[PDB]
Amino acid sequence: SYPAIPRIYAETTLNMLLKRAKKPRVHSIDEYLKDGGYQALEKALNMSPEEIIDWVDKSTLRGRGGAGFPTGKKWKFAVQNPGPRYFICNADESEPGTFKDRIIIERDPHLLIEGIIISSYAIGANEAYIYIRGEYPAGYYILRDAIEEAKKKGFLGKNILGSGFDLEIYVARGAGAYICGEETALIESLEGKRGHPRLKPPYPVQKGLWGKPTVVNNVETIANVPFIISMGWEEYRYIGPSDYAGPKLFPVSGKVKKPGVYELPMNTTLREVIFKYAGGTLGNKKVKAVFSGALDCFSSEELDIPMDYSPLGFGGTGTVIVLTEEDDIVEAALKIAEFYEHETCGQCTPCRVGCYEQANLLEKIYKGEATEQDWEGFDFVNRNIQPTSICGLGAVAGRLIRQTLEKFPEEWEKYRK
Amino acid sequence: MFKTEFEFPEELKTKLQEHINYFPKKRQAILLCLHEIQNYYGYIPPESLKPLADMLELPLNHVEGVVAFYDMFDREDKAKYRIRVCVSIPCHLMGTNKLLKALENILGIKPGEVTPDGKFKIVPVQCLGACSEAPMFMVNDDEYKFESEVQLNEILSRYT
Numbered sequence A: 001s002y003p004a005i006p007r008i009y010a011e012t013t014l015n016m017l018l019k020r021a022k023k024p025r026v027h028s029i030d031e032y033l034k035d036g037g038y039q040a041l042e043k044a045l046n047m048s049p050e051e052i053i054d055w056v057d058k059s060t061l062r063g064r065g066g067a068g069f070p071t072g073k074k075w076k077f078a079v080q081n082p083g084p085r086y087f088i089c090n091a092d093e094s095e096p097g098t099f100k101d102r103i104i105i106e107r108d109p110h111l112l113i114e115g116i117i118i119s120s121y122a123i124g125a126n127e128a129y130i131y132i133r134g135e136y137p138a139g140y141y142i143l144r145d146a147i148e149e150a151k152k153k154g155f156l157g158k159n160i161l162g163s164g165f166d167l168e169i170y171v172a173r174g175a176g177a178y179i180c181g182e183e184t185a186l187i188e189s190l191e192g193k194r195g196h197p198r199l200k201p202p203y204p205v206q207k208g209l210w211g212k213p214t215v216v217n218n219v220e221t222i223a224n225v226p227f228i229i230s231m232g233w234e235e236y237r238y239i240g241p242s243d244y245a246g247p248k249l250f251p252v253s254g255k256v257k258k259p260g261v262y263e264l265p266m267n268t269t270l271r272e273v274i275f276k277y278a279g280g281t282l283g284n285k286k287v288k289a290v291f292s293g294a295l296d297c298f299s300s301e302e303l304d305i306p307m308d309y310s311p312l313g314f315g316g317t318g319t320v321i322v323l324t325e326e327d328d329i330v331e332a333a334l335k336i337a338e339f340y341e342h343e344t345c346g347q348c349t350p351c352r353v354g355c356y357e358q359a360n361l362l363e364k365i366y367k368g369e370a371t372e373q374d375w376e377g378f379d380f381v382n383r384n385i386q387p388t389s390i391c392g393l394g395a396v397a398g399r400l401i402r403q404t405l406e407k408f409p410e411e412w413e414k415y416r417k
Numbered sequence B: 001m002f003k004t005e006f007e008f009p010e011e012l013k014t015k016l017q018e019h020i021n022y023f024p025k026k027r028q029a030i031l032l033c034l035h036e037i038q039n040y041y042g043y044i045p046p047e048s049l050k051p052l053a054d055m056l057e058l059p060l061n062h063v064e065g066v067v068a069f070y071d072m073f074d075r076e077d078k079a080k081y082r083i084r085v086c087v088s089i090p091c092h093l094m095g096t097n098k099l100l101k102a103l104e105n106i107l108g109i110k111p112g113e114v115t116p117d118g119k120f121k122i123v124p125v126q127c128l129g130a131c132s133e134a135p136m137f138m139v140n141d142d143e144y145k146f147e148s149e150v151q152l153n154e155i156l157s158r159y160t
């Protein structure tokens, strides 16, 4: 008995991360075990930590949380520093368009738990955390329940499967701040403080929770780890392009026939995501733009790019928000501006004032109330949110909007009128 | 004019102690506690911070800064059920306006307002991570997609 959640459509061509999570219900431990679950953990505990880090490195697994950093290399940075060490699963997922993580958490929690246990063992962490946004209450309770199931089977607690490895997983909840998704801000919140990002470097792997070596990984990243152990790193690499290995979840939303989460290899193009898998657009209207969450804007001329972490790739979290020919780009830009207005933590002055002014000036532009000075101010503010910024939000708060100005000048000019 | 000193009832206090004992350090439980308090009272009583701080073994100003930072925690208004309405993209394309209008029709209130009864408050929020099923809203912990005014009315009738 959990709080009500929507029925998010899910589809897979690889049958890995969504083997169970393609069905909208909670898969409990008995069902997970029947599908071969927790065997990868047992195999992992028979290996050395160093071997596991090596496999994850050689798999070429990259972070699924937006930045695309090599997971193995991240873990190696942590273990070069003396323990104790901490492992954190990041389940804050609060970016517009992004709902890929929740379907793993709510439908296949044991997949995530297995990955956390293996990952923790790899980096020598005896204490692990899941930080889940507060707007995912069912996920919180589902995880709490699944963790207790795992403990009763002896996959958590002391002396797991006679290995002598000890692990406890704690579930913490956010409270409505997107910034808590930033890894240093997340760590601050775990210490019981305001989610204020820290100056990086140092990176968490050097100094994290309680100033100790800490790895932070995205839910989706961690869900890959059982597969790498189970299949071996080489078989994992044969999934998808040689350069960008493994399954990837693509949350697709906006005006498509079949909005939902698609598990696809990263050699899939953006056009294929929308037309082949998502079924095309509602009313077969032409695609005007795709918003990569709140990070980037792609035009219709950019639909043939691969959904990978290459320089010319889609990148990000694979979030695909589709806008059709009828949808106003300025209106959409306003919504992105409003997002950053609401989410800036306020530590840095240009970010604090810039995010505010970007949204407020854009609102006036949208309502046809903007003076000529408002237009000049909007342009200036958009370009000056980043100075002095200590985290990624300040660096990207004007990125998507600037791209709309560059890619849709004709549409912006009508608001100039 | 006189007011009674603030205490937590025993049922609520037990849950707060549970959260406080859950993590390795007490102060890590602060957000779980605040979530628990808000669901219990329908808001965060200003008086509640001092006793919470003592349980968390924190200075009051620390707790005050935390409550202020997370604006979702509401010290101003008391409401039994919080209707969180996604006002983000792409919900705006899929009919957030219709939902807001239907809410106004049924309950007679606009975003950020509380019913005179004091049972329902509409809170505008950013993306709820349910975008494929837009437009989206929550009633406390429960989450639903909006279809129609009659559909919305039936859902709301479940909260009393």
Ligand SMILES: Cc1cc2nc3c(=O)[nH]c(=O)nc-3n(C[C@H](O)[C@H](O)[C@H](O)COP(=O)(O)O)c2cc1C
Pocket: A062, A063, A064, A065, A066, A067, A068, A069, A071, A090, A091, A092, A093, A094, A095, A178, A179, A180, A181, A182, A183, A184, A216, A217, A218, A219, A221, A222, A391, A392, A393
């Ligand atoms: C403002 C901001 C918000 C972020 N939100 C998230 C989030 O919700 N989930 C997440 O996994 N990473 C998020 N990140 C990225 C994390 O800081 C970090 O790069 C990531 O969690 C590392 O895991 P990965 O290597 O598995 O991707 C965010 C970054 C920034 C700058």
Ligand code: SF4
Pocket: A179, A196, A197, A343, A344, A345, A346, A347, A348, A349, A351, A352, A389, A390, A391, A392, A393, A394, A395
């Ligand atoms: S850049 Fe913005 S969000 Fe990041 S720490 Fe500074 S003020 Fe906060």
Ligand code: FES
Pocket: A096, A097, A098, B086, B087, B088, B089, B090, B091, B092, B126, B127, B128, B129, B130, B131, B134, B136
């Ligand atoms: S934009 Fe409303 S749920 Fe994401």
Ligand code: NA
Pocket: A005, A006, A008, A024, A102, A103, A106, A107
């Ligand atoms: Na779900």
